Enzyme design. Structure first.
Site: not given
Ligand SMILES: Nc1ncnc2c1ncn2[C@@H]1O[C@H](COP(=O)(O)OP(=O)(O)O)[C@@H](O)[C@H]1O
Ligand SMILES: Nc1ncnc2c1ncn2[C@@H]1O[C@H](COP(=O)(O)OP(=O)(O)O)[C@@H](O)[C@H]1O
Ligand code: BEF
Ligand SMILES: [Mg+2]
Ligand code: BEF
Ligand SMILES: [Mg+2]
Lengths: 374, 374
Positions: B2, B39, B102, B106, B112-113, B115-117
Site C-alpha cells: 500500500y 437535469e 456568476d 442567468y 449552479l454546480h 455538472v448536471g448534463v
Molecule cells: N488517515 C489515513 N491513513 C491512510 N490513508 C489515508 C488517510 N486519510 C486518507 N487516506 C488516503 O486518502 C485517500 C483519499 O482520501 P479522501 O479524499 O478522504 O477520499 P476517500 O476516503 O473518499 O478515498 C483515501 O482513500 C486513502 O487512500
Molecule cells: N438547454 C440549454 N441552453 C443553454 N445553455 C445550456 C443548456 N443546457 C446547458 N447549458 C449550459 O451548460 C452549462 C453546464 O450545464 P450543466 O452541466 O447541466 O450544469 P449547470 O446548469 O450546473 O451549470 C449551463 O450552466 C449552461 O451554461
Molecule cells: F447545477 Be448544475 F446543473 F450541475
Molecule cells: Mg444544469
C-alpha cells in the site's frame, strides 16, 4: 452577450470553495463544520477497518482548529507518477483521488468518492499534515488548499501514522464557527462500539476535558447503552454477526416500554440517517418472522424498538453524496435472509422474551383500537 | 502492499460512472433514471428563467431514449480557449463547467454546480446534441460520454435552441430501466405553474399519448389544482409575489378540511423535498401572524394546509448536491418579513376566511385534547 467566453471551468479545489454545499453540506448551522472532522475521522476508522489502526486521538485545539491522529499505515509519501508530486499531495489537492476505488488497500471502507479530505483541505485556511511511514516522519502545510511546500522528511521513526490538523476557513463557514464537544463525542462513542479493540481519545484543549472510548461489547453493548435510560422490557438482546455472499451483517436489538422507534443503520461504519436497503431488509424480516411466530403460537390476525444494523459491503452504492441512504440492492436480500433465519431462532430459544415483545406489539394495537370512541 | 501506486485518479467523467450515487442518485429504483431527464429539463427551464425560452418539448422515444427540445439561446458553439474545443463539448465532458457560476448569463438559475448534463452524458450509452445558434445548426454525438466527432455545422437556420436526446447506459441503471410517463408529467405540470407563458409539451412515442402544459394562474392556480380533490374550506387563496433585497418571494396557500400538511418549497424552480430556510421563514411568519390575529380577536391562549413557497435567489446554497434543502440564511428572514407583512394584511381584508382557518386550527386542538379520556 452569451457565448463561449461565458463558460468557465473550475479547476483543482476551486469548485469546493465555490459550492461547499455540494461537498461538505450546510455551512451555516454547524453540521458541515462538524462534518469536516468526521471526514477525517472516517479516513482513520478506515485504516482500522483494514486491521492497521488501533488508536485514534481527536483533539480540539484552543485556536479553533481540530486534529486527528491515527496509528495507521500513513498516507503514502512517494512520488506519484502521472501527477508528478507526492501521493499525499495528490490526495489533498485532487478530487476523485484515492485508494478505495478498488479493493486492494481497504477490502471495505467508508470512503469511496476520493474527495473527503480533499474537501477539508479546500475549506480550511490552514492544514497541517504529518505522516509517519517507511521509517521517516514527513510533513507539509497548506493554506486554502495550497501546498506551501513539497512534502519533506523531517526526522526518523519506527512509528506508523497520519496526523491532520485543520483550521476551517471562515470565508466559508458562518454562524456556527466553534467546535462543540458533544457533537464530536457522540459520534466517537458510537464509533467505539462499531470498532471493538480500537482506542478513540477525544481531547478538548479549551477546558482540559477528555474522553477515552474503548467499549468492548460491540453493537450488543451499543444497544444496552441506548436502552440505558428507558426501561428494557426484556433481558435478552438479540444479536448476530455473519458474513455470507460477500456481505457482513450484524444486528442487535431490544425493546423498551417507551413509544419511539430508533433503528440505527450503518454501512462500513458510515450512518444512514435515511435508511435504505439494509433497513428495508431488516423490516421485512422483522414482520415475516414475527407473524409466523404469532401464527404458530395461536394468535389470531415498531414502538419501543431500538436496533442497530451495521453492514460491511465491499462496493456500496449510495443514493447521494452524503451517504445517507444505501441502495446496493443485494443488501436488502442479505439482511432479510439473515434476520429471518436468526431472529426466528432467537424467538424459539427465548420464548419468554418472545411473548413479552409480541405482548407489547399487541398492547399498542389495543390502545389505538380503543379510539373507536366516536 | 500500500503505497503511491495504490492511489488512482479518476479523470473526465470516469468518476461519474464509477460513483453515480454521488451525482445522479439511486440507480436502481428509477429515481436517478428519471432525474436524468430532469437535469436536462432544468437546463431548459433556466433558459426560460432568463427570458429566452418559451417552448419546451420532452419526448419519450420508442427506443427507450428521451429528448428535450428547447427554443432557448442554444448552448454556445465557438471554440473554448484554454480547453481547445467547442464550448458545447466542454460542458458535456467537463465537471464543474458552465455559466451559472456568476450572474452574467442567468441572473437566476436552478443550476449552479456545472455538472448536471455532464452527468447525463456520462451515464448515457448514447447522447445526441443539436444546437441552433448564430444562424447555424450544429450537431454532435457521444457514446458513454465520448465525442465521436467534433461539433459541426450541418445547415442554416434563423431558429435558436438546444436539443438533447440520451439513451441511458444499462451498465449503470438497473431494475427500473423504462421511463414512466406520469413521473415526467407530474414535474412538468408543476413546472408550467412555476413558469407562466412557457409551453411545455410531453410526448410519448410508445403509445401516441400527449400533454401540453401551459396554465396561466401561476402558483395561485397551482394551489387550486392541489386542492382540486380535497375540499377547500375557504374561497380566497392567499397569494403574493415580491422581490426585495435581491430576493424573489412568492407564496400561495389555502386550507382544506382534510388532515395532511403539504407545503411545497422551491428555489429557482428546483424542489426542496426537505425544506430549509424558506420553509422555516414560512412557518415562523405563519405562527407569529396567526397568534397576533387571535390575540386581537380575543381568543385566549398545520392540518389541512396546502401551500407553495417559491423563491428566486441569485446565488443559493444548498446543504447537499441533491438541492433538497436550502441553507442560504438570508432567505429565512426574507420569507418571514414578507409573509408577516402580507398574511397579516390578508387576514384583515378577508376576516371571513380568517375566522374559518383559525376555527379549523382550534377544532384540531379540541379533538386531541378530547383524548383526555384515560
Ligand atoms: N488517515 C489515513 N491513513 C491512510 N490513508 C489515508 C488517510 N486519510 C486518507 N487516506 C488516503 O486518502 C485517500 C483519499 O482520501 P479522501 O479524499 O478522504 O477520499 P476517500 O476516503 O473518499 O478515498 C483515501 O482513500 C486513502 O487512500
Ligand atoms: N438547454 C440549454 N441552453 C443553454 N445553455 C445550456 C443548456 N443546457 C446547458 N447549458 C449550459 O451548460 C452549462 C453546464 O450545464 P450543466 O452541466 O447541466 O450544469 P449547470 O446548469 O450546473 O451549470 C449551463 O450552466 C449552461 O451554461
Ligand atoms: F447545477 Be448544475 F446543473 F450541475
Ligand atoms: Mg444544469
Ligand atoms: F471519503 Be471519500 F470522499 F468517500
Ligand atoms: Mg475519505
Amino acid at each position: 452577450s452569451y457565448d463561449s467566453s461565458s463558460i468557465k471551468v473550475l479547476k483543482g479545489l476551486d469548485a469546493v470553495r465555490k459550492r461547499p454545499g455540494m461537498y461538505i453540506g450546510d455551512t451555516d448551522d454547524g453540521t458541515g463544520l462538524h462534518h469536516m472532522v468526521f471526514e477525517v475521522v472516517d479516513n482513520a476508522i478506515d485504516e482500522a477497518l483494514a486491521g492497521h489502526c488501533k488508536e485514534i486521538i481527536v483533539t480540539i485545539h484552543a485556536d479553533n482548529s481540530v486534529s486527528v491522529q491515527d496509528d495507521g499505515r500513513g498516507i503514502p509519501t512517494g512520488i506519484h507518477p502521472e501527477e508528478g508530486v507526492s501521493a499525499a499531495e495528490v490526495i489533498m489537492t485532487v478530487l476523485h483521488a484515492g485508494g478505495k476505488f478498488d479493493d486492494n488497500s481497504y477490502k471495505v471502507s467508508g470512503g469511496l468518492h476520493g474527495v473527503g479530505v480533499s474537501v477539508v483541505n479546500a475549506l480550511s485556511q490552514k492544514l497541517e499534515l504529518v505522516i509517519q511511514r517507511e521509517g521517516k516522519i514527513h510533513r507539509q502545510i497548506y493554506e486554502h488548499g495550497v501546498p506551501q511546500a513539497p512534502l519533506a522528511v523531517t526526522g526518523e521513526t519506527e512509528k506508523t501514522g497520519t496526523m491532520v490538523r485543520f483550521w476551517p476557513s471562515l470565508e466559508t463557514f458562518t454562524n456556527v464557527t466553534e467546535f462543540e464537544y458533544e457533537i464530536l463525542a457522540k459520534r466517537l462513542r458510537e464509533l467505539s462500539f462499531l470498532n471493538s479493540g480500537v482506542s478513540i481519545r477525544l481531547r478538548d484543549k479549551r477546558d482540559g476535558k477528555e474522553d477515552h472510548f474503548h467499549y468492548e461489547g460491540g453493537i450488543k453493548a451499543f444497544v444496552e447503552y441506548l436502552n440505558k435510560n428507558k426501561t428494557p422490557i426484556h433481558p435478552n438482546i438479540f444479536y448476530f454477526s455473519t458474513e455470507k455472499d460477500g456481505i457482513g451483517v450484524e444486528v442487535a436489538l431490544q425493546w423498551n416500554d417507551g413509544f419511539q422507534e430508533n433503528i440505527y443503520c450503518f454501512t462500513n461504519n458510515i450512518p444512514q440517517r435515511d435508511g435504505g436497503t439494509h433497513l428495508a431488509g431488516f423490516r421485512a424480516a422483522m414482520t415475516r418472522t414475527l407473524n409466523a411466530y404469532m401464527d404458530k403460537e395461536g394468535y389470531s390476525k415498531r414502538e419501543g424498538l431500538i436496533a442497530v444494523v451495521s453492514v460491511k459491503v465491499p462496493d456500496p452504492k449510495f443514493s447521494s453524496q452524503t451517504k445517507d441512504k444505501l441502495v446496493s440492492s443485494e443488501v436488502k436480500s442479505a439482511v432479510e435472509q439473515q434476520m429471518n433465519e436468526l431472529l426466528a431462532e432467537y424467538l424459539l430459544e427465548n420464548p419468554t422474551d418472545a411473548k413479552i415483545v409480541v405482548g407489547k406489539i399487541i398492547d399498542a394495537a389495543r390502545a389505538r383500537e380503543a379510539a373507536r370512541r366516536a
